């Protein structure tokens, strides 16, 4: 029953590969259904066309800011932001999909894909999904990142939606 969605990544317009995720709607429903609805585009905005503004090798790839494309805003499906669902799931390793907030209870549309164990984020960031396939795509676009998160190339979500 756990939704599966995907991202078709491209490096400067040129298609890179597909990355799919399993969303734990059974544990984190509002948070999962938020990501799910934004991956497809069930409301007119969403992750399509948006990019990964912040990428730090060995840490994570952050995207989701479809409105500002910098990390300032972006927005969920419930107006603007919403509270933390819970912290049941932990940042166990690469592939982990977590919400990128700006202080407790400010989950909007932004998220990050882990490329390493980041347990220090446990309790601060809501873990709601994980890459199922395409961890080598996430890793390929990671090299186009940096220390401060600036991307040396324009990594975009060329396409996205729900496979089940």
């Amino acid at each position: 029953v756990n939704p599966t969605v995907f991202f078709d990544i491209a490096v400067d317009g040129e298609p890179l590969g597909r990355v799919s995720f399993e969303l734990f709607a059974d544990k984190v429903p509002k948070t999962a259904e938020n990501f799910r609805a934004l991956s497809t585009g069930e409301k007119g905005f969403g992750y399509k066309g948006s990019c990964f503004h912040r990428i730090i090798p060995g840490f994570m790839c952050q995207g989701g800011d479809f409105t500002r494309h910098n990390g300032t805003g972006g927005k969920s499906i419930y107006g603007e932001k919403f509270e933390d669902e819970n912290f049941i799931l932990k940042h166990t390793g690469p592939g982990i999909l977590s919400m990128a907030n700006a202080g407790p209870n400010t989950n909007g549309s932004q998220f990050f894909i882990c490329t390493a164990k980041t347990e220090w984020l446990d309790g601060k960031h809501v873990v709601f999904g994980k890459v199922k396939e395409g961890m080598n795509i996430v890793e390929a676009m990671e090299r186009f990142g940096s220390r401060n998160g600036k991307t040396s190339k324009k990594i975009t979500i060329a396409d996205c939606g729900q496979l089940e």
């Binding site: 907030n101 932004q110 980041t118 220090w120 960031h125």
Partner: peptide
């Protein structure tokens, strides 16, 4: 500004 830090 949103995002996790190391």
């Amino acid at each position: 500004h949103a995002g996790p830090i190391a």
